[model samples]
Target: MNIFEMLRIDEGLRLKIYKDCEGYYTIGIGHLLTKSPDLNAAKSELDKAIGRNCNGVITKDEAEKLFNQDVDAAVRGILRNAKLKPVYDSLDAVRRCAAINEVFQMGVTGVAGFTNVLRMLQQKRWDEAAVNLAKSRWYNQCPDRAKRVITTFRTGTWDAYK
Candidate 1:
């Protein structure tokens, strides 16, 4: 499956502001709006940026724009990490896309926090890395998503798509 297709399905198309699983006031395809810890302030900025009353809603085009930006940001973020960079370079395009999906879902910092799994990947221990990914809160939250990513980790291919 296409990476965008996977992420869009996983994140869902939210054209309006809604509380996420963690209760963060988010809008536009999981694009976070609570960056300031102040809901009002975030809303104000969002409205200004979107040039409308985006306090409660956003257009699909707007959401799609933000989603692409966020996804690409995570793509760059994966390469920015010294440790993760080498592992990323060692992997195939499909495995690389898997890592991009990971960083996009969890952010670079969250992905960076996967020290044990990072070490496993660095050692080229695919099975170890896969298991490490499985035993996580994210896995509990979305077992199917984790399973697909873990399959890529173990096989270095997007076999899960098939």
Candidate 2:
């Protein structure tokens, strides 16, 4: 019932850098390398977190540190993306994480397109928002992921993807 646990359940643990769902060079939890607004800042943070460049293998401790850094950046990203911050703050932790989960798969611009779903969230209509989310292009493109986010949005609990 901690942030790390939630991250692990959502992102899956990987000690090495690899391509993410959207083909970006991601490392440690769900760090999206290409999506970072500032490459130098991201690179600096990654280097500091792992004590080396992201071009090589990482130990578990390094991976965990990188994961935390990524999550911190993601939180800042959510806040900076005006379209997502209001809804992120309005939501409970689990529901906030549901939005963050989608942000991970698709960037902030991607999640910003969920207009109807965001509207529903802003109105505090959890069930309606979940339904709205289920009808998105994102949902059509990735039903399993949609299911997990929708379920969490409605229930405010982590429902690990099965």
Candidate 3:
């Protein structure tokens, strides 16, 4: 499973993937009204990534080049709109894994993003750290599904929906 599978639209929640002028695909977390601040930013990045790709504006081989740059812009825009930062910052590892995974799926070369998350938890290990680290990488065969999630999957739910 890729980021697409982990963030898949299920029974109630809907995950919409949009394409832009540049042919890059962005995965938005939810519909506009129900979207959280972080989800909004995530969607914005997805939109811009699509636009930039469709525009044929750049020739970079990696998709994340477009994602990070656009997400940074989205982050700044969101910061300007509200004084308080969203808990799931686009710059956070979970979001970055989603972004980078998008790139990796495009055949970009680099260290596995999820492994980095596991390594962070290995050193940080603050009670909830391990669970948080696995949030974005639970997909199957996913090079991104590092060992962290596998270790905790049978332990019981982490209950993030609340």
Candidate 4:
């Protein structure tokens, strides 16, 4: 039997999960860091940058502005040491990579897999990273950064993708 047929979700949704974006499995699964006191503090610090809430999805440009200050360094530094991802199975790694591209294009910070989040944290612009945070389905999934909520679209699933 098909996995979806056994699980009972619509096949369409399952296909959407795969087709949603390049990194759908990653973003959908998200990563879980092995927690430490320092990482906890880092999470709290990023919370501050989030402006007292998770409702605003900021752009990469805005994230850069927020993080450009040296004061933000402590937080960024804390995030730099965390693990890449925790939830994904090997089956979807490729899809997760593709989904990351869509996440950037769609302006959502879909940090579901390890490889994608690590790259985004180290290489992507702050606004784009923030946008990823803003677009994340959950905060703890990728607590390495904060996302802006205002500019982000609210779709839970990455459906607009081809």
Candidate 5:
């Protein structure tokens, strides 16, 4: 019902680092193999115990902490997108959360690549923004997710996904 719950459902909770559906070495809640201070620290600890292999496990609390850290970074990333910051801050909570989630999943630079969507949002064209998002490669890769985010972007509610 909350953002954390939604994210946990979207990205399955894992106690151990396992190859995801795409075979990326992943751990916690959908944390892809990427560089970060938390990740670096975790990796150092994991490697110390079990070589460089990423087959280590972590507690749910640790996972939640990492997820929190990642989410904070993602939200900051969205804010740092100077072009989108104003429009993003103007959005309602649901829409803002959806945008943050998109950044979390795709990274700020990845989301910034959706120039049409950004332009539509900048112009306060909700429908056009949703349409552009729906037409993106991200949408093609994750139709349901795109639908959910678009719905939130347009309606400013989580009802569609709920």
Candidate 6:
């Protein structure tokens, strides 16, 4: 599956307003409305995304818009990473998105911590990279999601969609 479809399943959806575990205003699929101590800015963005005043509910069109924006942010976040660039650039298209999926969940710093994983990817050792990532706390923490990601890493196809 594509990163958006993958992340939509991975993060799930929230069509209503709610505070996240970190207590920040969030909506859609993990779209952070604001940081902390910025209710005004948060309200502005939240209202803008939901259209009108954002009383309680969010429409699919609106949430999908924010969802796509958040995915773009995740991608740009990966693109901005320093040392992660070369390894990320080494993979083919769908596998490149697999990197983005994992990096989106773990962030660049978190993903970069797996130095051997990066090396495996940099060398185009697809199976080794998938195995290295699979044998980690990250994968252990969420086998279901990580399994799909690892499958993408190994096969370079959207097999997870099937």
lDDT of 5 at 118: 82
> What digit string (tens of lDDT, one per residue) describes model 2 on residues 1-162?
555566576567676656655545666777665555554655665576566776545677777776776667677788998888988899887788777677766767878888888888988898898887777666776566567777878888765543
| Arranged by TM-score, best first | 1, 5, 6, 2, 3, 4
For candidate 2, the TM-score is 0.73
Tens digits of per-residue lDDT for model 3, 55-101: 32233333434444434444444344332123224243544333333
Candidate 6 residue-wise lDDT, 69-152, digit = tens = 767866787778777888888789998888888876666778878899888888888889888888877677667878889988
lDDT of 5 by residue, 8-97 (tens): 766779877665543356678877654443546556655553344544777777678779987888888988888668778877778888
Off by over 4 Å in 2: 35-55, 135-146, 159-162
| Global Cα RMSD, each model | 2.3, 4.2, 13.3, 17.1, 4.5, 3.7
* CA-lDDT, candidates in order: 0.78, 0.71, 0.36, 0.30, 0.73, 0.78
Clashes of each: 0, 0, 9, 26, 0, 0
Best candidate, TM-score-wise?
A: 1
Q: Where's the lowest-lDDT run of ten residues in candidate 2?
A: 33-42
Candidate 5 lDDT score at position 120: 77
Model 4 C-alpha lDDT versus the unseen true structure:
0.30
TM-score of each candidate structure, all chains considered together: 0.84, 0.73, 0.25, 0.20, 0.79, 0.74
Residue 25 of model 5 has an lDDT of 60
Task: Please give the range of 10 consecutive residues that has the lowest summed lDDT in model 1.
Answer: 16-25
User: lDDT for model 3, on a 0 to 1 scale?
Assistant: 0.36
Q: Which clashing pairs does model 5 show?
A: none
